[PDB]
Design an enzyme around this catalytic site. Structure first.
Site, PDB file in Angstrom:
ATOM      1  N   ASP A 292      -7.138   6.707  -4.940  1.00 51.82           N
ATOM      2  CA  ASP A 292      -6.585   5.370  -5.345  1.00 51.82           C
ATOM      3  C   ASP A 292      -6.489   4.959  -6.678  1.00 51.82           C
ATOM      4  OD1 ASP A 292      -9.155   2.959  -4.051  1.00 51.82           O
ATOM      5  OD2 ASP A 292      -8.952   4.250  -5.744  1.00 51.82           O
TER       6      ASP A 292
ATOM      7  N   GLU B  95       0.887  -1.239   0.001  1.00 50.78           N
ATOM      8  CA  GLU B  95       0.081   0.033   0.055  1.00 50.78           C
ATOM      9  C   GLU B  95       0.756   1.325   0.058  1.00 50.78           C
ATOM     10  OE1 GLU B  95      -3.891  -1.919   0.152  1.00 50.78           O
ATOM     11  OE2 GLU B  95      -2.986   0.116  -0.326  1.00 50.78           O
TER      12      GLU B  95
END
Ligand SMILES: [Cl-]
Ligand SMILES: [Cl-]
Ligand SMILES: [Cl-]
Length: 162
Positions: free
Chosen positions: A20, A11
């Site tokens: 994202d 991540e």
């Protein structure tokens, strides 16, 4: 290697709100804030989660606290889930990390939709599970990460992260 080190590599750690891959507002170590297009709502979400006025920026310590919570939630969600649990129970340890990784990124509902891969994981047909999971939106959207997690499941080892 552990689930934490595994997820931090996948991540990254970011201290200011970002979109994202899917355009969703996220922060810290893959912490989804909102699917809402509004950055205003993302900032609200954020102060409520931290319990302070962040103005869209947080500390490493705050990012880690959210991480500790998100990972714990992934784990309890699997364990309470009628569909995910028998799978998790049946696996060895490294493969168990793979499933947690998937649940952290896509949610318990997303993962429960991988009906066919779950069924082959249970049945210990590693190659078939990898092939099925690879035919997914997940796979086409974040390919390097998906390959690493898939390889994890396939092999039972941490090689892709090494
Ligand atoms: Cl599937
Ligand atoms: Cl596909
Ligand atoms: Cl990727």
């Amino acid at each position: 290697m552990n689930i934490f080190e595994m997820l931090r590599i996948d991540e990254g750690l970011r201290l200011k709100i970002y979109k994202d891959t899917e355009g969703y507002y996220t922060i810290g170590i893959g912490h989804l804030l909102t699917k809402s297009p509004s950055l205003n709502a993302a900032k609200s979400e954020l102060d409520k989660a931290i319990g302070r006025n962040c103005n869209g920026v947080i500390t490493k310590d705050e990012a880690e606290k959210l991480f500790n919570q998100d990972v714990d939630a992934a784990v309890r969600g699997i364990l309470r889930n009628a569909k995910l649990k028998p799978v998790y129970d049946s696996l060895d340890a490294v493969r168990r990390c793979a499933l947690i990784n998937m649940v952290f990124q896509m949610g318990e509902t997303g993962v429960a939709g991988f009906t066919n891969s779950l069924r082959m994981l249970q049945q210990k047909r590693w190659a078939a599970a990898a092939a099925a999971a690879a035919k997914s939106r997940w796979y086409n959207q974040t390919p390097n990460r998906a390959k690493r997690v898939i390889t994890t499941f396939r092999t039972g080892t941490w090689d892709a992260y090494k």
